[PDB]
């Protein structure tokens, strides 16, 4: 789910 | 004020449709595909892996670029407009399921922008 | 002595605006919320945290006096990202494009 932070 | 004369070339002729589908594959999809943000859209949403067990309950017509690419490559579509609708469903699905402001939504919006920019240049 | 206002107005209305409104702006528009993102150690590895939200408020409140300060805050934001994240990460690619643009914009900065 997302930029992968 | 006399209007444009009636059509003399027929939009249903095969190449007119194939040329549009080809532009959707080679220009439109391809551009979106090479974008840094494509990767979460290159395959169907993997509900199990990402652990989102309501996804397929909420989203009734899943769509992703990998599936669109396949359809474009395998005689699925009658016309470009059907393909355009699959893109729209892909974006809409993401906006429906996710919270405004989530990374994924912001990434879909950047894709949708580029998509709309390229669609504007579809040959007719 | 002299507040470098001409340079700082350029920074707010030309430079900041451009990066603020860029497609890749959002991760940088506020300080890194390390709770929400569960980066427990962020604030142990980044000792000088910096973001455009903070730069923006500063420029808007005449916080700054020197142009070089504000320009250095941008540099710190970009470096903060490269030190905390692996090269190739989506966020690193974003920071890179924002930086190249900033460098581009900074080149036309007015003179003191």
Author numbering:
A (entry chain E): 1 to 5
B (entry chain A): 43 to 166
C (entry chain C): 56 to 167
The authors write:
Bromodomains (BRDs) are protein interaction modules that specifically recognize ε-N-lysine acetylation motifs, a key event in the reading process of epigenetic marks. The 61 BRDs in the human genome cluster into eight families based on structure/sequence similarity. Despite large sequence variations, all BRD modules share a conserved fold that comprises a left-handed bundle of four α helices (αZ, αA, αB, αC), linked by loop regions of variable length (ZA and BC loops), which line the Kac binding site and determine binding specificity. The four helices form a deep cavity that is extended by the two loop regions (ZA and BC loops), creating a largely hydrophobic Kac binding pocket.
